[PDB]
Amino acid sequence: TSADNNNSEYSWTGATKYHLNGRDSLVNPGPAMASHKDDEEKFFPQSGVLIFGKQGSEKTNV
Amino acid sequence: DGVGNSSGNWHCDSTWMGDRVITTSTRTWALPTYNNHLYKQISSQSGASNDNHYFGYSTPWGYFDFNRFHCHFSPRDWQRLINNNWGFRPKRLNFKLFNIQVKEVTQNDGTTTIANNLTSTVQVFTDSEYQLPYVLGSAHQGCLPPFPADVFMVPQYGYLTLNNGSQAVGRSSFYCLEYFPSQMLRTGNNFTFSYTFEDVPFHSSYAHSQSLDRLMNPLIDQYLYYLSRTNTPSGTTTQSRLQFSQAGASDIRDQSRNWLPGPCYRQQRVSKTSADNNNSEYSWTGATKYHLNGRDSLVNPGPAMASHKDDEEKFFPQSGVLIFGKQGSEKTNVDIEKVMITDEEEIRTTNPVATEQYGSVSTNLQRGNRQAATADVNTQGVLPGMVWQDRDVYLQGPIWAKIPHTDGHFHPSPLMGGFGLKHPPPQILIKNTPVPANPSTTFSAAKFASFITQYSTGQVSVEIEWELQKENSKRWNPEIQYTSNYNKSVNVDFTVDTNGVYSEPRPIGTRYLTRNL
Amino acid sequence: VFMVPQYGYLTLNNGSQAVGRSSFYCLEYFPSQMLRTGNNFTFSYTFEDVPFHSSYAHSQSLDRLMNPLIDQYLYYLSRTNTPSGTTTQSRLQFSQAGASDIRDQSRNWLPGPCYRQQRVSK
Amino acid sequence: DIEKVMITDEEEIRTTNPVATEQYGSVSTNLQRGNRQAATADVNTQGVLPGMVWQDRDVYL
Amino acid sequence: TWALPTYNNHLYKQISSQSGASNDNHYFGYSTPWGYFDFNRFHCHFSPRDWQRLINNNWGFR
Amino acid sequence: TGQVSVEIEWELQKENSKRWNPEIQYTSNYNKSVNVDFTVDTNGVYSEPRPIGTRYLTRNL
Amino acid sequence: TGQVSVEIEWELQKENSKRWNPEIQYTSNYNKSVNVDFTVDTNGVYSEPRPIGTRYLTRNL
Amino acid sequence: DGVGNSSGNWHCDSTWMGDRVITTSTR
Incomplete structure (x- = not known):
C-alpha cells in the first residue's frame, strides 16, 4: 500500500x-x-525477495 | 655402528617429478644442557597485568622445529612452485638424526677445554600419541635455518597449563617427559621415523581474476526486478510510489546475486606513512x-x-597481517624499516577489506513519519552463501598447525596460514643424558646436583613430499610471475653479503597465477 | 512406580486459532499391537554414528598454547607514537612477542561464538 | 527460592568458550587519522568465524 | 513399574492458549487419549555409582 | 499397569592420560551426615542432592 | 654411572560394587595454589605432599 | 658391544590392559 x-x-x-x-x-x-x-502480507523486504515481471513489463521504473 | 663410521650422509635437494616435489634439508645442530637437567615451575612476574598471567613448566628437553617453508624450499624452489602450480599440499615426511657427538666441557682455571665423550647418550622420542602440550604451531623461533650452511641451536621445550593469576589450579597438569619411552643414542647411533600427512585441502596458490560482485554477463539484462525508486515527483512535491527496474550494466550494483563475501572482524587501519x-x-x-x-x-x-x-597499499590492518623481521632486526620497538609487512590484497575479490565494514543493515521499521535507518556491520559471522579465501602462505611463514582437540571447530584452517592438521607432524624431543660427576665415598640419599658439563651436536635431515596441482590456464594474455629484480645491485637478493650473512629481503607469497571464480 | 504421561502436540497457530497449514493426527490411523494379560511388547533400535561426548575438561587455555621460553619471529605493532622533544610524534614501532607480552602473540585460533547473557548473583 | 533449585556450572569450558555474561571482544569502528582517534566497540553477539573452536555443553545425570 | 490411566475419556481434543494470553504465549494443538514412554534422562539408565564409574575413567561415551 | 525394561549399550572412550600429578575425581563427601547423598530418608523418599556433570578428567588442547 | 630399568607386572582385582550411592575416590584438591601437588617447584625440587593409601573403595564384610 | 653403541633404551610408562598393569621405571 503506497501510503x-x-x-x-x-x-x-x-x-x-x-x-x-x-x-x-x-x-x-x-x-x-x-x-x-x-x-x-502487504509488507515485504526491500531487496529480500525475488520479483518477477508480468508479461510485457518494461525495464526501468515500472 | 662403532666410532669411526658416520651414521648418515648429507642430503639437500629438491626433486620435481610429475605432480610431486620432494624437498630434502640437512642441517647441523647443537644441543646444550637445559635447566641443569631440572624441571622447573615457571610463572608470570608479580607485577604483570591480568592479560599477561601464565603458569607452566620448563623442561630439560629440547625439540626440533621445521614448521617454516624456508626450512624445505630454496628461494629458487619457491619460485618454481608458485609460478607453475595452482595448489600444493604435504603428503609424507622423513626425519633423521645422525652423526651424534657428545662433548665434555672443562672450564677449569678459566681455560676451556672440549673433549669427546664416546660413551654418553642423547635421549630422543617422538610424541606420536600427542600426549604432550603441542607448542609447534605457535610461530616460535628455533627453526632449522633457511640457509643450509648455518648451524642452529636446539630450542628448549616448555609448556603452559591452567593459571589463576600466577598460580595453578586443580586442573593444572604436570608432565615428566622421562615418563615416556625414548631411544638412547651413542656416537654411531642414528634416529629415524616416518610420518604420513592426513588428507588436507590444497593451498590455493592463485588469485582470482574475477570479483564476486562482477560475475554476470554485462551484455544482458536480468529478468528479476529491484526497487529502484520509492517516490516520484507529484506536482510541486513528491509522493510515495514504489517503482521497479531490471538491472543491467548501467546499474550493476543493484543486480540480484547468489553469493556473499566472507566473514569480517574489523581491524583498525594504520598508514605506512608516519604523518x-x-x-x-x-x-x-x-x-x-x-x-x-x-x-x-x-x-x-x-x-x-x-x-x-x-x-x-600504504594502509594495513593494525594486527591483521603477518609481519616478518628483516635480517638482524631486534626484539623490541623497532622501526617500520626493520620489518616486512605482508600484503593480503589478492583476496579482496571475495573477502572484505580488514579495515572496512562488512556492509549495512536496516535498523528500524520505516513509515510515513519515520525514515529508514541503516547501521554499519563491523563484525559478521558466517552466513549461508558466503565464500572466502584463506590467508596466503609465505616462504618465511609457518606450514601447519595442530587443530585444537574440541567438540566443534568451524573451517579449521589456521589463522596464521597453512594446513590445519588433527594429527600434525609429532614433536621430536631431545636431551643430553645427565652424567654425574665424582660422588662422595659415603652414601648420601640427597639427589645429585653435580654433573659433568656436556653438550651434543649432530646432523638432522628432513624430507617432505608435496603433491602439486598444476596450473592449467586458458587465458590468452600472459600472467603475473614472481621474478627477481632486473637491475644491478650491491648484493643479490637471497644471498650472503661480504661478511657471510644470509638474508631474506622480502616476503614471498604464493598467489601470482590467476583463475576465474 | 511412575505414571505414564499424556501425549499431545502443537501445530501452527495464529493467535489461539489454527491456520490452513495446521495438521491434525489421529494416532489410531497407525497400526498398533494389541496386548492382553500375558502378551509382551519388544523392539530394538540402533543409534546412528554420533560423536562421543567430551567428558573431560581442558588443562590448557586457547590463549596459552605457545612455548613460554621462546620468542616469536613475527612482529606486532607495539607503539604508535614516541616521545619527541617536549611532546610525542606519530611513529610506528614493532616488537616480537615473548612471555613478557604474552597477550600480543600471533595465534592460530579463535574462541567459540557468543550470544551475551545478563549476569545474576547468587 | 534459590535454595530450592540446583544451578549447574559450565565453568570448565572457559578454556575455549567465551564467558556467557561478557563481550566476545572488541572491534574497530572507524578509520583513524591525524585528527581522529581510534574507536572500538564491544562485540555482544558473534557468529561463527573460520578458526573458531569450542566445547559443547556438558551432560548431567 | 508403570501405571496408565485413560486420558481425555478416550477423546482427541483441540486445545489452545487462553484468551487473555500474551502473543508470545499463544499456541494451538491437540491432546490425545494416548500416553508415551520417556527414558530420555541419564538417571533413567545410570545409577549414581554407575555415573561416578563413567565420569572418573572415560574421556568419552556415546 | 505393567513393567517396562530399557537396555542401552554405550561405547566408551577410555582415559589414557600421561600427566604426572593426580587428577580431579568425583567423590562422595568425607564427613558424617544425617542422610547419605543419593539415598532414601527415614520416610522412603529418594533424592538427588546435587547435579553431576561429566568433566573431571583433563586433556591438553 | 649408568641406567637401570625395573619392570613389574601387577595382577589386578577389579572393583565390582553394587551399592547405589557414589563412593569415596582419591582426588586432587580443587582450589588454586602456588605449587601443584606432586610437582616440582620453581627450583626444580619434586615433593610428595601427603601419604596416599589404597583404601578408598568399600565392600561389605 | 663396542664403545659407540648404547646397550639399551629409556623405558618409563605404565600399561593397563585387563586385569594386569605393567610399570616400567628407568633411572
Missing part, C-alpha cells in the same frame, strides 16, 4: 548492502528470511 | 581483541581479510 511508505528516496540509502574492495553492492535477495509475519 | 596516523598510544586501546576467561588477547592476524582496497 504506508515514507515520502523520500531511500531505495539505496536505506538498502541492505555489502562492501567489497571499496564498493557497495545491494544484497539481493540475500539470506533466506521470512517475508513478513502473521497478518502482514 | 597519516594519530599522535597517541592506541596500539592496545585501539586493538582488535577477544575476551577469554576475563582476559583480553590481541586478535593477530585474525580472520583472513584484504589488507587494503584499491590504491591504498
